[PDB]
Amino acid sequence: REEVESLIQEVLEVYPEKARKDRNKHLAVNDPQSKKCIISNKKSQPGLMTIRGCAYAGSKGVVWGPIKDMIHISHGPVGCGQYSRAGRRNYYIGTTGVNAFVTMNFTSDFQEKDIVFGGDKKLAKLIDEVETLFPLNKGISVQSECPIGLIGDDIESVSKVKGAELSKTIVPVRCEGFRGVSQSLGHHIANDAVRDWVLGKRDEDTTFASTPYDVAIIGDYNIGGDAWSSRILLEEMGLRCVAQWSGDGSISEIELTPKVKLNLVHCYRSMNYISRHMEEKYGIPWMEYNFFGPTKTIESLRAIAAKFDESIQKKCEEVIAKYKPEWEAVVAKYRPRLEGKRVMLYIGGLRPRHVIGAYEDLGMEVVGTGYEFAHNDDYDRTMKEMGDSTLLYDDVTGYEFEEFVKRIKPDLIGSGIKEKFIFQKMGIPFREMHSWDYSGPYHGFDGFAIFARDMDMTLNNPCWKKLQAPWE
Amino acid sequence: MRQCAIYGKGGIGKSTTTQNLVAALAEMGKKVMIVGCDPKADSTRLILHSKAQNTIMEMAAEAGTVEDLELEDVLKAGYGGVKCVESGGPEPGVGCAGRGVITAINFLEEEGAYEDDLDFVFYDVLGDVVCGGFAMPIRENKAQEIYIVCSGEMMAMYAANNISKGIVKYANSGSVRLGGLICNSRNTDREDELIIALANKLGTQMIHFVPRDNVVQRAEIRRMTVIEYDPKAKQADEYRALARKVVDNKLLVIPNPITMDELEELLMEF
Amino acid sequence: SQQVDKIKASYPLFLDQDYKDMLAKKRDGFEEKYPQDKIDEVFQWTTTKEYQELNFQREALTVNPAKACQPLGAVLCALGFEKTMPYVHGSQGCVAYFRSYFNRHFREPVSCVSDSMTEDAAVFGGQQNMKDGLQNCKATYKPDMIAVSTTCMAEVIGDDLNAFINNSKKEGFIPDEFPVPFAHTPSFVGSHVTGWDNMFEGIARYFTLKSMDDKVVGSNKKINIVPGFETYLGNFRVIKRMLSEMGVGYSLLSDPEEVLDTPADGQFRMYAGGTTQEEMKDAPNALNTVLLQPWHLEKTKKFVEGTWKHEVPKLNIPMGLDWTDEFLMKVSEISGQPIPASLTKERGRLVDMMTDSHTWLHGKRFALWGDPDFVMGLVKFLLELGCEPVHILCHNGNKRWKKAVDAILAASPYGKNATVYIGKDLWHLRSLVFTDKPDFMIGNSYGKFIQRDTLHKGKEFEVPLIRIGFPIFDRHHLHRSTTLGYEGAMQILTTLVNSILERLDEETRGMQATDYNHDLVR
Amino acid sequence: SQQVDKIKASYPLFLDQDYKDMLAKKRDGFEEKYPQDKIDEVFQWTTTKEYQELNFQREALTVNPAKACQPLGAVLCALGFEKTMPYVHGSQGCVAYFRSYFNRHFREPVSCVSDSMTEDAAVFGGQQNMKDGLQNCKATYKPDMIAVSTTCMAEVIGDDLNAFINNSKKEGFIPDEFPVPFAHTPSFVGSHVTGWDNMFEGIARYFTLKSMDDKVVGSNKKINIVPGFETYLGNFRVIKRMLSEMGVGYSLLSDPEEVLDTPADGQFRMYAGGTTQEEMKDAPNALNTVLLQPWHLEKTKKFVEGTWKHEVPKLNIPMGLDWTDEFLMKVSEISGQPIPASLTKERGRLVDMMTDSHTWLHGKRFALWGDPDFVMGLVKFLLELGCEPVHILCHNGNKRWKKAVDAILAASPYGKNATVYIGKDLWHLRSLVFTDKPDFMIGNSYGKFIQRDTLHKGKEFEVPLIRIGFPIFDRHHLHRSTTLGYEGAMQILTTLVNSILERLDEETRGMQATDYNHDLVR
Numbered sequence A: 001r002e003e004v005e006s007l008i009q010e011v012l013e014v015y016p017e018k019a020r021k022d023r024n025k026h027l028a029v030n031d032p033q034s035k036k037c038i039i040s041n042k043k044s045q046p047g048l049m050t051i052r053g054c055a056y057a058g059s060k061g062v063v064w065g066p067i068k069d070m071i072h073i074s075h076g077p078v079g080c081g082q083y084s085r086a087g088r089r090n091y092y093i094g095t096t097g098v099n100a101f102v103t104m105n106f107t108s109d110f111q112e113k114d115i116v117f118g119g120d121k122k123l124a125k126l127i128d129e130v131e132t133l134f135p136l137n138k139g140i141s142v143q144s145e146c147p148i149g150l151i152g153d154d155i156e157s158v159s160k161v162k163g164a165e166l167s168k169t170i171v172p173v174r175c176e177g178f179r180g181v182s183q184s185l186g187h188h189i190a191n192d193a194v195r196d197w198v199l200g201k202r203d204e205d206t207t208f209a210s211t212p213y214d215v216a217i218i219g220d221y222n223i224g225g226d227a228w229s230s231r232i233l234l235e236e237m238g239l240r241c242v243a244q245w246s247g248d249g250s251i252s253e254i255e256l257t258p259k260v261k262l263n264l265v266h267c268y269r270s271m272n273y274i275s276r277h278m279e280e281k282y283g284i285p286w287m288e289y290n291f292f293g294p295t296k297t298i299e300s301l302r303a304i305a306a307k308f309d310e311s312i313q314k315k316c317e318e319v320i321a322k323y324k325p326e327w328e329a330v331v332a333k334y335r336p337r338l339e340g341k342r343v344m345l346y347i348g349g350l351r352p353r354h355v356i357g358a359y360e361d362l363g364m365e366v367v368g369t370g371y372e373f374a375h376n377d378d379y380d381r382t383m384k385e386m387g388d389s390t391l392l393y394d395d396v397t398g399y400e401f402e403e404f405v406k407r408i409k410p411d412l413i414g415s416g417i418k419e420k421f422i423f424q425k426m427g428i429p430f431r432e433m434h435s436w437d438y439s440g441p442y443h444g445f446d447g448f449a450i451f452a453r454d455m456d457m458t459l460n461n462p463c464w465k466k467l468q469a470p471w472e
Numbered sequence B: 001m002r003q004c005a006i007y008g009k010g011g012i013g014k015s016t017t018t019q020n021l022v023a024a025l026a027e028m029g030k031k032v033m034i035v036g037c038d039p040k041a042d043s044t045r046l047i048l049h050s051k052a053q054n055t056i057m058e059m060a061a062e063a064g065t066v067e068d069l070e071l072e073d074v075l076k077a078g079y080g081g082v083k084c085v086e087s088g089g090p091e092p093g094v095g096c097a098g099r100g101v102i103t104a105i106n107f108l109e110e111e112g113a114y115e116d117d118l119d120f121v122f123y124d125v126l127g128d129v130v131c132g133g134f135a136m137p138i139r140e141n142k143a144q145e146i147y148i149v150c151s152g153e154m155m156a157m158y159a160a161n162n163i164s165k166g167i168v169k170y171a172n173s174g175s176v177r178l179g180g181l182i183c184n185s186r187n188t189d190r191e192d193e194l195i196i197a198l199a200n201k202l203g204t205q206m207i208h209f210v211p212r213d214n215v216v217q218r219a220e221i222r223r224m225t226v227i228e229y230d231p232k233a234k235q236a237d238e239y240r241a242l243a244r245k246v247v248d249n250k251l252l253v254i255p256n257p258i259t260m261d262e263l264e265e266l267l268m269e270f
Numbered sequence C, D: 001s002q003q004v005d006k007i008k009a010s011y012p013l014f015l016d017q018d019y020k021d022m023l024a025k026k027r028d029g030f031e032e033k034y035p036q037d038k039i040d041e042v043f044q045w046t047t048t049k050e051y052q053e054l055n056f057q058r059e060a061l062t063v064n065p066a067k068a069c070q071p072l073g074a075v076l077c078a079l080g081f082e083k084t085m086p087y088v089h090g091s092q093g094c095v096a097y098f099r100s101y102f103n104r105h106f107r108e109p110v111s112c113v114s115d116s117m118t119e120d121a122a123v124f125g126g127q128q129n130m131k132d133g134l135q136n137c138k139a140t141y142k143p144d145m146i147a148v149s150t151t152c153m154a155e156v157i158g159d160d161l162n163a164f165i166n167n168s169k170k171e172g173f174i175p176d177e178f179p180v181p182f183a184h185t186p187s188f189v190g191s192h193v194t195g196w197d198n199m200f201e202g203i204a205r206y207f208t209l210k211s212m213d214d215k216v217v218g219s220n221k222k223i224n225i226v227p228g229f230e231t232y233l234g235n236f237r238v239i240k241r242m243l244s245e246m247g248v249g250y251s252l253l254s255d256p257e258e259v260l261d262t263p264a265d266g267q268f269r270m271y272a273g274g275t276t277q278e279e280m281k282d283a284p285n286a287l288n289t290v291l292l293q294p295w296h297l298e299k300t301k302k303f304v305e306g307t308w309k310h311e312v313p314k315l316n317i318p319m320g321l322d323w324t325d326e327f328l329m330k331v332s333e334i335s336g337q338p339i340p341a342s343l344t345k346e347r348g349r350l351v352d353m354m355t356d357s358h359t360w361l362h363g364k365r366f367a368l369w370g371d372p373d374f375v376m377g378l379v380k381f382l383l384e385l386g387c388e389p390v391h392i393l394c395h396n397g398n399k400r401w402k403k404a405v406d407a408i409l410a411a412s413p414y415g416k417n418a419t420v421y422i423g424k425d426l427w428h429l430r431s432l433v434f435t436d437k438p439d440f441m442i443g444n445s446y447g448k449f450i451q452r453d454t455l456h457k458g459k460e461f462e463v464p465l466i467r468i469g470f471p472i473f474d475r476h477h478l479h480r481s482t483t484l485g486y487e488g489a490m491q492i493l494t495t496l497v498n499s500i501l502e503r504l505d506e507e508t509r510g511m512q513a514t515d516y517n518h519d520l521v522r
């Protein structure tokens, strides 16, 4: 414990005084009430290379983007959309340009005259042109950028008028980037957008035939097909998955969600708001599940079955028995190549604590973890999972992460793209934990095999033994 | 060339005072040009003898950019050869006018506008300086002389103090200075009670005072400047006096903004 | 299910029968998908000329643009100076996006900071953000220079960068002599190339404007080279190599080749190479200033001619054969050094490859897109090859550039079927390649989605993509290639001829149907 | 029928209805072709495993060999010397075939002459043929030296090259001092690389045997470099560049890069560059001789060790990372020059590329064929990358080479599924790729006919070909690439990773079927 504190102080001795006090409160030594240990969801210190994004990234790129039959307009200048087009691997099935629009970049392409004179007229004309050119679209969302929030364009009025005139749902999202301190407020704003404009459209409709085994997957964005790899298990247990939020998700599934019997929430940080709203309004119980690795998958499946009758529990036992030999074989094959290794993680708001069980299932220890934009409840949850005298960092900077890695010297680092090559040039294997290094899925029993194979091919790749020239 | 900026409370009579001032400096020998800084462009009406309806912003929108905006299409002459360029912006409640100020001033910098033989460029800014864009006239290499136009009424003096607070940062970061306090009237009890007091508390002076001459409103009705409508009146003589003070102004101290408590005490002090 | 012997990733795992049944049930039950026949009719309609006429009347909607915003180019230009920190005064999500974009293109660490303005900073200004960010950045990362750009938020609210930096220096946050060049880079005008130009003009102004009393032209016997927005490292390398083989003294301003190509030897080098401040200060003393990409170096050209009094040559980008010769001849005239035998030999080698591959290259129809100078150089080189550019697209192009490209096309009999489009995006190009099918496209990774659409119309309608441009995301290490000079000409030639040959081999691989033309020798 | 606006070549003109009907009538009426079902049955049988045991029982029939005969290598070695004419004592058809082969590979003229030995010369001998041929060659083409090889006819009849040349010199057909080296190159032993080795030994013996008295090892402070049979000019360039960057004096014996890459400038050059006779004569004075391809330079090694008394280092081909490091360290030890910082940086850059592309390269299965040294270097580099070689075929390999490659494979975990085949041909490889499917093939252009076969079994069974080796006939300007060094390793790594990504993109371009994995970023 003392060594970790000493390293924290040594790293902190480089920042100016105000920066030093501010950064002191976001680093802690884990002791398995996070508020008394670490504080989160605070403004980043200027000029320190934070990793966090903006509210637009957390709204358009995370929540609304994966919705496939909708058209999402990045309202403002061209940069945001361009940089966020197809950057996230929220998989889907559809015909792009006809009935699916996830990998497309729709934008208003603001000019100087748009800023000076307003863009509501251009927004209405853009909606008309979208309706003309993409007839099979089932909705429109308008994601605001920074100038839209600054100049006070009344996009809500335009959305209402055009939704009345062309009889389709237009969701205005006030996700201008300067709002908040990270993507968390973008998640929140997108969730109230769904609540106010989409969720309650079928509140007076009783045409849907509901079964006692109705569940809705909440907060799974289908990274590399992850949601699919989960859904099959839930369907092999006799449950009917009505909706997926929002990976490969449709506006119809979101509209149908208030009819389910149970809400299985994967990502708390991004969808807990809508989960609580649905519990309070429609009375649907919701709970968290974890499908990372076999042990957490089995525990989650049994917990899910326990909410239903005996037939579901019997089918759950059958599913566990069926998939047991596969994950046992994967363990027996890949564990000896991985036992004893150490991992340091820095992911956004949910994954730093969910992937720990899968790492443990291969005999690997996590010595450091942290979040980009998580709140205090996330740290409350992750304190139990993390080991004693480990390291926790909230909104870590480039210098702090580099120094922490230099002194701790982990065997593997799992984090985003902006430090992948940084840690690659320091000779430490690195595994993208956002895009799964363009691999996956990692959820479920099928994803566990891919996770293990990726871990082995990265940790044990010979290239890491060749960074020193034989003559030096 | 003396690039000056006319600031102050909204509606206190900036473009009026500014227009008759530049017209008095005109037909005195010097060459001046007015540059407005508020979307409801009428700061050159008196000199132009007509509202412009031809401002930098609308023409830029028509052509597409300021890159296609030729300079001769927005600069016009007037009474005493006074050049006038209105720059314009959106109708109220829509768009962003400060960005329009930024674009138009940058366009006047790029297209050779200020590099003529004129003496004073008089920028004239709205009363509600709500963003950094409207502070463009007091950036570096921009206007160097600020003349806060304010009256003896309390609210105008509070606005003058707020403007001084705002321009402190630009003054420290650059070389633009507070030339003096221009006093209009509302026929109050002040007229030295809280105008010289505020000026000396701001470390500055009141550079001449112009009272509530009824002639100015009826000259405004006539599209006119007072010296052009009644060239032999008392208001016109007062306006040559103001022009003379502007010619030989040398007090250019950095503003010292007094606090709210000081203003509240000063109200009762006089 | 997974077999431990052959683990399947998403492809081809999700092609198993269980996953197909799961997807079928989900789609049939809860997605409310349109009938497949309706989707086919709509897709067919999107490929028709009527849909192209509907698409080309767009005045407010942009779909799949081919450009980025100014601060990206500002950051790229800032990275070309030694121990320089790109500092984007504005919001953080932008710097996050800039870094992500550049890591995906270069597969390299990219260093850039933000002052992270919040709603309070938008309402009240970013002066305190300026001060705290400058102090924190200098203390933490220890640059010799901080190059300041802006995000749009800052531009809209009129944040005075000069005043904020001066106030920072005066209040002791950073030393007075520490160089902090700045440039206003509003994202709502222009594109990334404009941001590069504005940043370079800001840096040159900061280092040269006030100290021109002691400068005389031609005293250091060098030529200033301004590369512009360049994402091929081989371009910097080939310019430097050609100048060095020539014996010409030169100063490459904003050279990021080292920082973007650091070796993996166990340590992380945040700064590498770059133009030095001494070179920037001595730049006015050069014989002349050569702009490699003049069509997005307008403000720099105005500053250099007006201040440094350099008679900037009217040179096209040194791409292809003719323009590389005109660049070499102009440099020889300016410096007085003759063109060495090595350059003549390498030109003759390029001509040899041209005559070797002209038979396969002749008459081929290409669509292409990218930045203005790059696009016009590609057009010229294709014209020199006997190829037929058909759809020339530049989203960030202007009317003067379009007139120049029209003049370039009209001078060759291979440009009669060529139309130049400006302000049009990749959806327009999708319509164009559906209605007037070319043989190939030449452009960045975003064109792959066009290829897919064409393949959905049929194998015979497919238009293969050739990845030359920025950004390239789905291929590795293509950023190491070269496009300028004779070397870039040979690389481009080889890529084109081998793409044509690979397509021909693909169309003739069918046994007993088309293999009669599956020739060993091509 | 042809449309004058869109003229169709053989493909797809012969896919027209009239041509299809004509061919159907011809086949049905007069070809007596087997029924189609029988053809499919036979093809499926050839793709099976029983056919593989039948194929591997071959002892007399060779189908689709992967080697050529000795005089080809002899001509290539002769082309590496200054103003040297390759003179092949034998039949004209051999020379015509050699020139056609090398022109097709290099897309460059190749100079070779023959004495046109005929049945009368076969019966009575080629002495008069030799005299007239040497006279006519020297008169017409004015070579500084004539390097003599042989065709299989001449070797069978036992024509004495030494006696014939000496009699030609003694009877005045050529000057006595004119250098005429010779080497017996029997096509029925060895392959082209053996011919290269024999010809080099002949030239070295001619210039150094009788003048060894005045030679002292290390007096001229250089390193001799023997490249061997090499068909990538970039390999010559990279060796020269790497030695020059080290500050090491070198003597590249048999350097043909200039004559095989002559510029096109309106004139034809029969000779350009090459090793000089003074360089060959001074070779015994060098510190040491390094053989870049030791597994086909056995005779050269014997001569250099026994006559020049050079302690020739035991070095593998400078391919990949480890072997290029060793080559550099051995050169540094021999010459005393430290390895510079630039070579270290280039090595670190290669390491960066490997760690960038390791995710896609790992676990991929490759069949590969070619020459011994090239094949073994490829195997070593693939093992370094984490790839799995599966079928390693070397037609002209020997038992000791197979033992060395097996030892190399045994030292890595990634060589556990690798089998080395010597004396086998491309029909054997076709059986191997049908029965034990690799992800890709690495070889020359002939492998295209294998890929086609695999595609005839199905898209799921296709083994794409990567064209690395000799000869490449269906692509252009690939002979300009590099294989040795850190540059060649980088080129091969880029080619491999982009082949993988191109195949992955093709496999997932299907709309609504597999396009969910059509990721923009890979």
Ligand SMILES: Nc1ncnc2c1ncn2[C@@H]1O[C@H](COP(=O)(O)OP(=O)(O)O)[C@@H](O)[C@H]1O
Pocket: B009, B010, B011, B012, B013, B014, B015, B016, B017, B127, B184, B210, B211, B212, B213, B214, B215, B216, B217, B220
């Ligand atoms: N000295 C004066 N005498 C009479 N009326 C005046 C005088 N100065 C200004 N006014 C009147 O007050 C109004 C002030 O409006 P304006 O000049 O636009 O002020 P500002 O530019 O500060 O908004 C004018 O329309 C004018 O008629």
Ligand code: ICS
Pocket: A058, A062, A088, A183, A221, A223, A267, A269, A270, A347, A348, A349, A350, A351, A352, A433, A434, A435
């Ligand atoms: S939504 Fe969030 S950064 Fe919960 S913004 Fe981010 S697809 Fe991360 S740790 Mo990218 S809070 Fe999802 C996330 Fe986690 S985009 Fe994905 S991987 S589980």
Ligand code: CLF
Pocket: A054, A055, A056, A057, A077, A078, A079, A080, A081, A144, A145, A146, A175, A176, A177, A178, C069, C070, C071, C091, C092, C093, C094, C095, C097, C150, C151, C152, C153, C187
């Ligand atoms: S927080 Fe404005 S165009 Fe978009 S990249 Fe920025 S300069 Fe360029 Fe940033 S990403 Fe956008 S602008 Fe704001 S909402 Fe978030």
Ligand code: CLF
Pocket: D069, D070, D071, D091, D092, D093, D094, D095, D097, D150, D151, D152, D153, D187
């Ligand atoms: S004229 Fe004609 S091509 Fe010549 S050998 Fe004679 S039949 Fe043949 Fe065959 S293998 Fe090589 S190329 Fe010769 S040396 Fe023997």
Ligand SMILES: [Be+2]
Pocket: B009, B010, B011, B012, B014, B126, B127
């Ligand atoms: Be006003």
Ligand SMILES: [Fe+3]
Pocket: A421, C106, C107, C108, D352, D353, D356
């Ligand atoms: Fe890299």
Ligand SMILES: [Fe+3]
Pocket: C352, C353, C356, D106, D107, D108
């Ligand atoms: Fe050639």
Ligand SMILES: [Mg+2]
Pocket: B014, B015, B042, B043, B126
């Ligand atoms: Mg006014």
